């Protein structure tokens, strides 16, 4: 039985460091129910470290977490010119937490889950998973690094 | 070989009809380079009938165009209560013309060419083509029946 934690598509509150020039919340809400996706596209401009924190979210008995992001990639050739610091990956990180850190963040005190790569807007899903955790919460985040990405999905659920 | 007539993704001026509570244009304008999206998300209302209109768009020597588009749909059954008036498809449709209508749209001028299919977000990727085509020009659209779809690709190409 897969018991969700998470399900940023169905409705949050996320931070972003740097605020503006980094990733960036897109919405529709001005329909009958909202739609909401993160993106960053800084293909151009070089050393890129561009982070998005989810919510605390809660552990409960979770023991190992897997974690399904949709998302699009545009490809690094499809920009003209050349953007000789475009990246088509970004990562996947966490953080361990018996409290709300509220709007506290620093990416020093995440660990690395993965890269993410896509293997001329192109799909993925991918799913990683982490474990053991033991503490009452979590928080997931993104780093981008140069990339050019929406994320349409981010489902965190165990098995139990 | 492909030859490449629209790609929205690759950067246009659409238009929606109704404008503001039907098609909406989601976008990240705050990085090197832009996101763009429509969607739409009109699930509750009932009776929807939003159309979103391409750019004119020339014919050269074209005569079968293919269309290719990427999108996410939102599963009915992911709205709690129910939302008896969603739907899961939408609707692609085309118009030629020698002359380009500017802002000037009427639905009953449009030519069905298909209902899309998927077959909680769902990532899609749909061809489908028509022709002969003939005239100077075309536009294409889409119309939302009360679909939760977001727009991530549109191109069209022939085969030279």
Chains 1, 2 share one sequence.
């Not at 953007?83 to 990180?93: I, M, Q």
């Amino acid at each position: 039985k897969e018991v969700v934690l998470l399900d940023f598509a169905a409705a949050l509150g996320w931070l972003t460091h740097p605020y503006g020039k980094g990733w960036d919340l897109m919405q529709n809400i001005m329909n009958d129910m909202p739609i909401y996706m993160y993106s960053v596209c800084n293909v151009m401009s070089g050393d890129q470290d561009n982070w998005l924190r989810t919510n605390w979210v809660y552990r409960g008995e979770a023991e190992r977490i897997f974690i399904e992001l949709k998302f699009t990639v545009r490809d690094c050739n499809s920009f003209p010119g050349g953007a000789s610091s475009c990246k088509e990956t970004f990562n996947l990180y966490y953080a361990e937490s018996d409290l709300d850190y509220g709007t506290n963040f620093q990416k020093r005190l995440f660990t690395k889950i993965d890269t993410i790569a896509p293997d001329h807007v192109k799909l993925n899903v991918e799913e990683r998973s982490v474990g053991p955790l033991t503490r009452k919460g979590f928080y997931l985040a993104f780093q981008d690094i140069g990339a050019c990405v929406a994320l349409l999905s981010v489902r965190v659920y165990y098995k139990k």
